[PDB]
Amino acid sequence: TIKEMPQPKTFGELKNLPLLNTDKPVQALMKIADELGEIFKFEAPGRVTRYLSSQRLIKEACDESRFDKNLSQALKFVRDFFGDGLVTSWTHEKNWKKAHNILLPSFSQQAMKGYHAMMVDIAVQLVQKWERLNADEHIEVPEDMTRLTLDTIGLCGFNYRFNSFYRDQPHPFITSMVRALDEAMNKLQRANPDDPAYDENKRQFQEDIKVMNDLVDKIIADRKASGEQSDDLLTHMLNGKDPETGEPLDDENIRYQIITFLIAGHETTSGLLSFALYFLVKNPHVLQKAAEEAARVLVDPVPSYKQVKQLKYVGMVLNEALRLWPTAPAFSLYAKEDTVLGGEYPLEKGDELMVLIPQLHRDKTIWGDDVEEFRPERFENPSAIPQHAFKPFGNGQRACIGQQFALHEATLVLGMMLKHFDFEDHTNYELDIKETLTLKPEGFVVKAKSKKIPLG
Ligand code: HEM
Ligand SMILES: Clc1ccccc1C(c1ccccc1)(c1ccccc1)n1ccnc1
To answer: Packing angle between helix 312-324 and helix 267-282, nearest 10 degrees?
Structure first.
C-alpha cells in the first residue's frame, strides 16, 4: 500500500539543510537512516533527494529499465572540472558511451597483466620507504597510501611519475586541485562575490587552473613526442576509435578523461588500503590469517600477477573494509518515468534517489546482526551474497570502470605489506573518519617492524 515517506526534522525555509551543517555529513545521514529506516526524504532550498538504505529498495533502484545514473549536486559541482569525462557525464550524452567503448579495453585482463609490473614498481617504493625508517619512527598510513595510489595511476595510466615518495608534501597538481575545488565551493557561499577582498582568491584560482592544465598538456605532449608509444590508458585515449562510430575522442574530451582518471585512480583506493590496515591491526586474529596467506603465496622476491590472484583472504579483507567504509559512499539515480518504488513510494519522472552505501552495507536482514564487526569470512562463499547487497562500485553500465585496477593494486600492496612487516597499533588509535567526497581514517598511524625479507 502507498506510504508516506519519512523525513527528518525541518528548519523553516532552510528545510533539512542544516542537519548537514557538520564536517561529517555522510555519518550524519547514516544516523538519520538509523532513526527513519530504509527510505527518507531530504529537502534543501530548491532541491529534493530521497536516501535509500535497504537492499530491497536499492535492488529496485538498480533496475536500469526504470532508473538511470543521476548527477547529484556534488557531481554537477565537480562537472565544472571533469566536464563530460566518464564520471561526470549523463548516460544519454554521446561522449559517455563513446568513451566507455574506447576505454573499456584499458581494463581488460591483458591490460591488467600489463599494468602489474608498474604497480610493483610503486609498491616496492612503499615497502622500501618503510624498511628505511629508523627506530621508533612511525608511519602516517593514509598519507603513504595516497603517495602510492597517486603514483600508481600516474605511472600505469599515463607513464607520468609523480615521484610522491621523493617529496614531503603532496604533488603540486593535487594541492592545486584541492585548492581550486575549495575556492569554487567558497565562491557559492560568498554574499558578495565581487568584493575586492577576494581578488587574491581569484588570482590563486587562475594559477591553480594553470597548474592543472600544464600537467595535462605535458602528459599528452611527452607521449606524442616519445619514441616509445606504449599500450596504456593514455594510448587508447589518444588513438582508440569507438567501434560503433569509428570516431576517436575529441581533444577536449581527452583532457577531461585524463584528469578524471588521475583523481578516480587514487583517492578512493588510498582510503581502502588505510581502512583495511586499520581493521587488521584492530583484529589481530584476522591480521595473522592474512599474514599467513601472504607468506604462503608470495614466495618470490616480487609478486607475480598470478600470485596476487591467489591472495583470496587478502581480497576478502579488502571487501570487508569496503563493506564497512565504502570510500565512495554514495551514488545517485533518477526515475526515468513516473513509477512506484517498492510498491509503496510513488515517484515522478526526474525524481532523485541517493544510495547510501554504508547503510546498505549494514542492512541486518542481509548480513545478520553483527553488521558492525569486521569479519572477512562473510565473503567466504560469494554465491551467498544477494545481488545488490554489496555495491561499493556502483551499478550497471555506470559501474566503476576501474574496479579491477583498484582491487588488484590494493591486493598486491596489502599482500606485500603483510609479507614484509609486523604492524603495531602503538597509539591505540581511535577511529576518526574525515569526510571530503571520500572517507579516510584521519591520523591513523602505526609502526612497522621489518621481517627482513629482501625484495627483488
Ligand atoms: C576502492 C576504489 C574505488 C571505488 C570505491 C570506486 C567507486 C566508484 C563508484 C561508486 C562509481 C560509480 C559512480 C556513480 O554511479 O556516479 C565509480 C565510477 C567510476 N570509477 Fe571508480 N572507484 C574506485 C576506484 C577507481 C579507479 C582505480 C578508477 C580508475 C582507474 C576508477 C574510475 C572510475 C570511472 C572512470 C568511473 C566512471 C565509470 C562510468 O560511468 O563510465 N575508479 N567508481
Ligand atoms: Cl567524485 C569523482 C570525480 C572524478 C573521478 C572520480 C570520482 C569518484 C570519487 C569519489 C570520492 C572522491 C574522489 C573521487 C566518484 C564519483 C561519483 C560517485 C562515486 C565516486 N570516483 C573515484 C573512483 N571512482 C569514482
So the answer is: 100
Backbone phi, psi, residue 66, to 5°: -110, -25
**Which whole-number Å values give the CA distances from 331 to 71, 233, 316, in the listed order?**
9, 25, 23
Strand partners, 441: 433
Sign of CA dihedral 436, 440, 445, 449: negative
Counting ligand 1 atoms within 8 A of each CB, the residue from 257, 258, 334, 393 with the most, and so the one to mutate, is 393
For residue 369, how far is its CA from the centre of ligand 2 (angstroms)?
Answer: 30
CB 69 within 8 A of CB 97: no
Q: Are 200 and 242 contacting, i.e. CB atoms less than 8 angstroms apart? A: no
In order of their start, the domains of the chain are: 1-456 (1.10.630.10)
The C-alpha cell of 28 is what? 550524519
The C-alpha cell that represents 3 in the structure block: 506510504
Method of determination used here: X-ray
Q: What is the SS3 assignment for 172-232?
A: HHHHHHHHHHHHHHHHHCCCCCCCHHHHHHHHHHHHHHHHHHHHHHHHHHHHHHCCCCCCC
Closest by CA position to 256, among listed 89, 85, 74: 85
Q: Whose C-alpha lies nearest to ligand 2, atom 10?
A: 328
The answer to whether residues 145 and 221 touch, using CB atoms and an 8 Å cutoff, is: no
Which residue has the least CA distance to atom 23 on ligand 2? Answer: 264
- H or E element, residue 331: strand 330-335
The response to whether residue 361 sits with its C-beta less than 6 Å from ligand 1 reads no
How far is Cα 112 from Cα 405, in angstroms, rounded to an integer? Answer: 7
Q: Which amino acid type is present at position 17?
A: L
Mutate which of 71, 73, 87 to test ligand 2's pocket (most atoms within 8 Å of Cβ)? 87
Say if residue 324 is exposed, middle or buried (CB neighbours under 10 Å; 0-12, 13-18, 19+). middle
Cβ atoms within 10 Å, residue 102 = 23
Q: Which cell goes with 248?
A: 576517436
What CA–CA distances, in Å, run from 24 to 11, 36, 297, 360? 19, 19, 39, 18
Pocket lining: 356 vs ligand 1, CB cutoff 6 Å: no
CA-based radius of gyration for the chain: 23
Q: What's the resolution in A?
A: 2.1
CA 293 to ligand 2 center in whole angstroms: 31
Using CA atoms, how far apart are residues 14 and 383, in angstroms rounded to an integer?
45
